[PDB]
Design a protein around this ligand. Structure first.
Ligand SMILES: Nc1ncnc2c1ncn2[C@@H]1O[C@H](CO)[C@@H](O)[C@H]1O
Ligand SMILES: [Cl-]
Lengths: 101, 112
């Protein structure tokens, strides 16, 4: 993993490639505020959460995902959350299946 | 009207509604992929997340907070998954923005 694997950074968030990718494009959007899980976000996080989704879709465009993609947020053990910090997964570059896990 | 979600919003198609306010509507998915499977949609007919814009920032955050609030109400304390599909490769199918909330079983990886 190299510095260029950070695709985007601002005062609110970091975007970086997943080193265990599940699709030809697979990156991760995280807040800099250490919200551990989406179930523990609060009303004060409204604007931040909206920003994370906008950054996810902006980065998807930058990564050439013009034919579609999937955003995923995992909560807790049943969601298969792998790190207790909020992550938005963005997957693209192949046909995504249904159900989504 | 662009999609069947327009009928859910105007109540001409009866749906199992879990939450409603002036910005969004939450209802059960009629082809559920998990023991709990519901959709959070804006009343503003944004067709796809790739077509959301900066003016939608507040709305988008609100949709996520409503998703997690409703997940709690539905008893998803041991975990759940939120999914937003964009376009054909995302398997979106209905072109009105919606967040899937799935819980009540172990979710697998990869997520499709
Ligand atoms: N009339 C409906 N009521 C609730 N969910 C629906 C309806 N039509 C489609 N969906 C769901 O919306 C998603 C996009 O097609 C799928 O999960 C699908 O089952
Ligand atoms: Cl995760």
């Amino acid at each position: 993993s190299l510095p260029a694997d950070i695709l985007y950074e601002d005062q609110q968030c970091l975007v970086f490639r997943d080193v265990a990718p599940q699709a030809p494009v697979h990156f991760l959007v995280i807040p800099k505020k250490p919200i551990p899980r989406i179930s523990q976000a609060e009303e004060e996080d409204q604007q931040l959460l909206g920003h994370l989704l906008l950054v996810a879709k902006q980065t998807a465009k930058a990564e050439g995902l013009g034919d579609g993609y999937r955003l995923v947020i995992n909560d807790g053990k049943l969601g298969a959350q792998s790190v207790y910090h909020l992550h938005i997964h963005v997957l693209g570059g192949r046909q995504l299946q249904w159900p989504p896990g």
